[PDB]
Amino acid sequence: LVGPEPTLESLQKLGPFEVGTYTVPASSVTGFGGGVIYYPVNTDKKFPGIVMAPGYTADASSLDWLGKHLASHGFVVFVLNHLSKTDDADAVADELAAGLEYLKTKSPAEVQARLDASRMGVAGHSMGGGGTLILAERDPSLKAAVPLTPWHTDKKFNTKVPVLIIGAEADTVAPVSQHALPFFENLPKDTPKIYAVLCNASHIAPNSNNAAIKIYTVSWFKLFLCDDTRYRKFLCNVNDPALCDFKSNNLFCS
């Protein structure tokens, strides 16, 4: 627990770290189409890593704002591009797995220097959010998972990884009653979990700078990747007019 007390206001602005990027060419990796690594600069500290997948028709650019935002708060964030053969959430989970392994073991020395590989999370949008849930079920070493407007046909994920699902009230692609909410409801009983629904939002709310997404994603990754328990308060007694539904279990709110 280092540095100033977080506030609601501080979570919505860039954090205290300046951000650098390294662009990963498709030709330098296998299992995904390259992507962009965002990381704190002007620091010898190490930070937890987060690998993020954008929606199916998208590239890493579609989550650029969130990569920068998270990195500024003290994370190494790797946003992937898809392989052209990818065609379902399962393949996106393969991309995320390949991205994680790349980030931890095959990224440049400069990136590895900034990374604490013992603390890793995942996030994804749309089909990427489906991929996030599939990967959380496959990879129990992960410390947090954030599916954004997740879209998938299977509803049950057997994972202990803390899951923050952010849905959109007016989602025409992945209606929360058939996607986000079943995903939440079918998680194991002891898994730390949130279901949060953005009022009046579309499926592509996550592709634009969003106050609620900033607050909940930074807090989730801080609590679960960094064990920074000062962020629990943003996840407890939530009375947020930007949300039109909210459920949680096993956050250990006091």
DSSP assignment of 23-70: EE-GGG-SSS--EEEEEE-S----EEEEEEE--TT--GGGGHHHHHHH
Contact criterion met (CB below 8 Å) for 86 and 56: yes
**CA-based Rg of the chain, rounded to a whole angstrom?**
16
* Interacting residues of 63 by C-beta distance below 8 A, sequence separation 6+: 52, 54, 79, 125, 206, 207
CA dihedral of 180, 162, 50, 243, whole degrees rounded to 10? 40
Residue 174: CA atoms inside 13 Å, Cβ hemisphere, count? 29
- By annotation, the residues acting in catalysis are 126, 171, 203
Write down the experimental method used for this entry.
X-ray
C-alpha span between 91 and 82 (Å, rounded): 9
| Of residues 92, 15, 4, 56, the one with CA closest to residue 203 | 56
* Interacting residues of 178 by C-beta distance below 8 A, sequence separation 6+: none
* DSSP state at residue 108: -
Exposed/middle/buried for 68, CB within 10 Å: 0-12, 13-18, 19+? middle
Tally of helices (H runs) and strands (E runs) in the chain = 7, 9
| Of residues 212, 136, 135, 197, the one with CA closest to residue 166 | 197
8-249 has CATH 3.10.20.740 classification: no
C-alpha span between 92 and 251 (Å, rounded): 28
| Helix, strand, coil percentages in the chain from 3-state DSSP, rounded to 5 | 35, 25, 40
Structure tokens at 170: 């007016």
Stated resolution in angstroms: 2.0
